[PDB]
């Protein structure tokens, strides 16, 4: 309940590896993550996903697929974060470093969960298993999960 703000998150997932970026500034700096950000006025959610992927990594894609939705609450912040998660295996181009992100490929048994947001350990396996999901995570600061829910869905 309450006003929420729209965000995107894009995971480039190939058969034996996944592309992540080391966030170089701002919110989440110092952690590996997918590519994304705030959705702007005048663009769809999926347009916003492609825009952030191109700005942060130089990549474009043929198709994005909806895989999940995660709602974040941060203690003492008024806006909830409504994050729409997408995947793809159809990249056009070679990934390149930006002001915001330094991209690297990881093997699927070497995903660096110790240096990622702590909710990723819960929902990433569902992404890897190609299951669609709805998550909720309540955070105190950037390290501590106070409450969460997670379930599989038919419709994202
Ligand atoms: C795209 C904006 O997503 C983020 O703000 C965020 C916050 C907390 N855990 C997270 N895990 C992955 C992303 C993420």
Swiss-Prot record:
Impact when changing residue 150 to A = Reduces 2-oxo-dATPase and 8-oxo-dGTPase activities and increases thermolability
Q: Which cofactor does it need?
A: Mg(2+)
Gene Ontology molecular function terms on file: 2-hydroxy-ATP hydrolase activity; 2-hydroxy-dATP hydrolase activity; 8-oxo-7,8-dihydrodeoxyguanosine triphosphate pyrophosphatase activity; 8-oxo-7,8-dihydroguanosine triphosphate pyrophosphatase activity; ATP diphosphatase activity; dATP diphosphatase activity; hydrolase activity, acting on acid anhydrides, in phosphorus-containing anhydrides; metal ion binding
Note the coiled coil stretches, chain numbering. Answer: none
Query: A cellular component term (GO) from this record?
Result: nucleus
Q: Which UniProt keywords apply?
A: Cytoplasm, Hydrolase, Magnesium, Metal-binding, Mitochondrion, Nucleus, RNA-binding, Transit peptide
Q: Which Pfam families match?
A: NUDIX
Q: Where does 8-oxo-dGTP bind?
A: 8, 23, 33, 35-38, 117-120
In the record, biological process GO terms are:
DNA protection; DNA repair; purine nucleoside catabolic process; response to oxidative stress
What is the activity regulation entry?
Inhibited by 2-oxo-dADP and 8-oxo-dGDP.
Sites binding 8-oxo-ATP sit at 27, 35-38, 52, 56, 117-120
Q: What is the effect of changing residue 55 to G?
A: Loss of activity
Q: Which CDD domains match?
A: NUDIX_MTH1_Nudt1
The record gives the effect of mutating residue 119 to A/N as: Loss of 2-oxo-dATPase activity, reduces 8-oxo-dGTPase activity
Outcome of mutating residue 40 to P, per the record?
Reduces activity by 97%
The observed outcome of changing residue 156 to A is: Slightly reduces 2-oxo-dATPase and 8-oxo-dGTPase activities and increases thermolability
Residues recorded as binding Mg(2+) 1, renumbered to this chain, are 36, 56, 100
Tell me where on the tree of life, at the top rank, the source sits: Eukaryota
Outcome reported for the amino acid change (mutating residue 53 to P):
Loss of activity
> Ranges for the Nudix hydrolase domain?
3-132
UniProt-annotated binding residues for O(6)-methyl-dGMP = 8, 23, 33, 117-120
Q: Where do the annotations place N(6)-methyl-AMP binding?
A: 8, 23, 117-120
Q: What exactly does this protein do?
A: Oxidized purine nucleoside triphosphate hydrolase which is a prominent sanitizer of the oxidized nucleotide pool. Catalyzes the hydrolysis of 2-oxo-dATP (2-hydroxy-dATP) into 2-oxo-dAMP. Also has a significant hydrolase activity toward 2-oxo-ATP, 8-oxo-dGTP and 8-oxo-dATP. Through the hydrolysis of oxidized purine nucleoside triphosphates, prevents their incorporation into DNA and the subsequent transversions A:T to C:G and G:C to T:A. Also catalyzes the hydrolysis of methylated purine nucleoside triphosphate preventing their integration into DNA.
Query: Which family does this protein fall into?
Result: Belongs to the Nudix hydrolase family.
**Subunit:** Monomer.
Output this protein's name.
Answer: Oxidized purine nucleoside triphosphate hydrolase
Q: What is the lineage of its organism?
A: Eukaryota, Metazoa, Chordata, Craniata, Vertebrata
């Amino acid at each position: 309940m309450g006003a929420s703000r729209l965000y995107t998150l894009v995971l480039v997932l190939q058969p034996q590896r996944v592309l992540l970026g080391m966030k170089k500034r701002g919110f989440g700096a110092g952690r590996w993550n997918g590519f994304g950000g705030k959705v702007q006025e005048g663009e769809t959610i999926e347009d916003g996903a492609r825009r952030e992927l191109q700005e942060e990594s130089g990549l474009t894609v043929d198709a994005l697929h909806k895989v999940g939705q995660i709602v974040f609450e941060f203690v003492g912040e008024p806006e909830l974060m409504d994050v729409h998660v997408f995947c793809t295996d159809s990249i056009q181009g070679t990934p390149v470093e930006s002001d915001e992100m330094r991209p690297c490929w990881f093997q699927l048994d070497q995903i660096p969960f110790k240096d990622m947001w702590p909710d990723d350990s819960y929902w990433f396996p569902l992404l890897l298993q190609k299951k669609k999901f709805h998550g909720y995570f309540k955070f105190q600061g950037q390290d501590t999960i106070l409450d969460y829910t997670l379930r599989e869905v038919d419709t994202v």
